[PDB]
């Protein structure tokens, strides 16, 4: 009997009254439209935006912490080399804005050096991420922005084939150029090659080298696309699982362990993978929201009073829209809790508070690599956790409005079934 239960659950009675009233339903639908703009159209105040940003920064920060300590080398086939030095620019090396891969003889592989092939994949994802962070991530709804990205690396040493025609696609090693396209979006890549003799004016380094420049145009900077880059970054590290060994500064904070394999940071890597996974799911709710717009008013028809049992075919879409917004908000929260040092323990807590959430650059804008970036995240991790929490606190009203819209729609889906 229904009186007997509206006795105890008086808020259920209010819910039913609202579900029978077009003007309460239309108010809830307006609320959903405004909260959707907060979630997918804003930046500072969107918890969804802040959580995407945080997932990306944690991946980037992870490599800023460990990249300088990571062995790499060999030749183009993932094979060992006799005397190859390959240097990647705008990377966070030891007292340097480049990372040098020059470990010879050892076979690239697990607990060994990272192959140049893996490093190239890693490096490209990194350069793209840092260029986009530097320019500022767009709101979640902006799906067609692009960024331009340029990066360089060099090869020296006898037998080094990492800058050759097969590695590169480029015909003349001195002065040649090649263009190729790729993917929903077309990205153009221009690769050019130049040789610099040991004697040339300039040329600190005693030695002859080849320089490769890559210029990518039309790189998508949408959230979904940047998350895919962050995933490539962290998965390449975890799959390649190269040897590292760290310089622990006398004084400083202490990195444990000091030698080992990169995939040995298992809690850190799992956490970051899980953040990215949750942010990809979060960004997927965008299309659910878009395809179920709530801006058309609803009512009875032919001037007949509204009948909640027959006139409510919109409810399904309203519920899917409300549920999707709630899901964004919960996943945004869950990204934050995965990395927030307040709920972390032991070695993983030390990693985040001592390294990942710090920056040693002498704030520098996001995406800047200096000779002091190494061993620190330099990716605004702490500021982003704070801004995520601030944005969630400023979403108190909208969250209740979303729950209410969901309860209304769900009451109407029930009545119509």
């Amino acid at each position, epitope marked *: 009997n229904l009186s007997k239960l509206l006795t105890r659950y008086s808020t259920l009675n209010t819910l039913i009254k609202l579900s029978a009233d077009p003007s309460a339903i239309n108010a809830a639908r307006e609320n959903l439209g405004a909260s959707a703009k907060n979630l997918i159209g804003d930046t500072k105040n969107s918890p969804a935006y802040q959580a995407v940003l945080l997932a990306i920064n944690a991946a980037v920060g992870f490599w800023n912490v460990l990249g300088y300590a990571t062995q790499c080398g060999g030749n183009a086939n993932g094979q060992e080399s006799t005397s190859s030095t390959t240097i990647f620019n705008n990377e966070p090396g030891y007292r340097s804005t480049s990372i040098t891969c020059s470990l010879n003889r050892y076979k690239p592989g697990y607990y060994g050096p990272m192959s140049i092939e893996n490093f190239k994949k890693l490096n490209e994802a990194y350069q793209i991420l840092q260029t986009a962070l530097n320019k500022g991530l767009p709101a979640l709804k902006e799906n067609n922005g692009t960024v331009s990205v340029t990066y360089t690396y060099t090869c020296s040493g006898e037998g080094n084939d990492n800058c050759s025609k097969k590695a590169t696609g480029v015909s003349d090693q001195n002065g040649g150029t090649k263009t190729k396209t790729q993917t929903g979006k077309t990205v153009t890549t221009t690769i050019s090659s130049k040789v610099v003799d040991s004697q040339a004016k300039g040329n600190t380094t005693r030695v002859s080298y080849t320089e490769i420049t890559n210029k990518l145009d039309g790189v998508p900077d949408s959230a979904q696309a940047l998350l895919a880059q962050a995933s490539t970054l962290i998965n390449t590290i975890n799959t390649a699982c190269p040897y590292f060994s760290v310089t622990n500064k006398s004084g400083g904070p202490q990195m444990e362990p000091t030698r080992g394999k990169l995939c040995g940071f298992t809690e850190e890597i799992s956490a970051i993978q899980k953040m990215i996974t949750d942010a990809q799911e979060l960004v997927n709710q965008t299309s659910v929201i878009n395809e179920h717009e709530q801006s058309t008013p609803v009512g009875g028809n032919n001037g007949k009073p509204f009948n909640p049992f027959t006139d409510a075919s919109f409810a399904q879409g309203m519920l899917a829209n409300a549920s999707a917004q709630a899901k964004m908000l919960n996943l945004a929260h869950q990204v934050g809790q995965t990395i927030n040092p307040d709920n972390l323990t032991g070695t993983f807590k030390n990693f985040v508070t001592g390294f990942l959430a710090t920056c040693n650059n002498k704030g520098s804008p996001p995406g800047t690599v200096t000779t002091q970036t190494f061993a620190s995240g330099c990716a605004y991790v702490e500021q982003t956790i704070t801004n995520l*929490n601030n944005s969630i*606190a400023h979403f*108190g009203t909208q*969250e*209740q409005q979303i729950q209410q819209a969901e309860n209304i729609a769900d009451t109407l889906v029930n009545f119509g079934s």
Partner: nanobody
Amino acid sequence: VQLQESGGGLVQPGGSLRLSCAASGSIFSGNVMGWYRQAPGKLREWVAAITPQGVPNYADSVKGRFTISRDNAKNMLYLQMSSLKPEDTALYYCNRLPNYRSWGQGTQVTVSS
């Protein structure tokens, strides 16, 4: 997984009251926390929130009259209410934001002359 409000009662307009909420660690720690209320004939309304670092914000209906605070060592959330009005009469609840989906009992506040 526990939310326990207390401190409510019947007071006079113009009056004061301080509400308490004991929350479990897993709800409270490193989360935004907040207060809500449910008045007769209405659904639950958000009232105030506070970040782990202590930054408070408020709904317009209570701003300048209520103060939310938190005690991170004891997992306690507080709402100091002043210049109370009949319209502040309601069941008050605390939760994290976003909400854990089981609400506690709440605590009744009645303001009446």
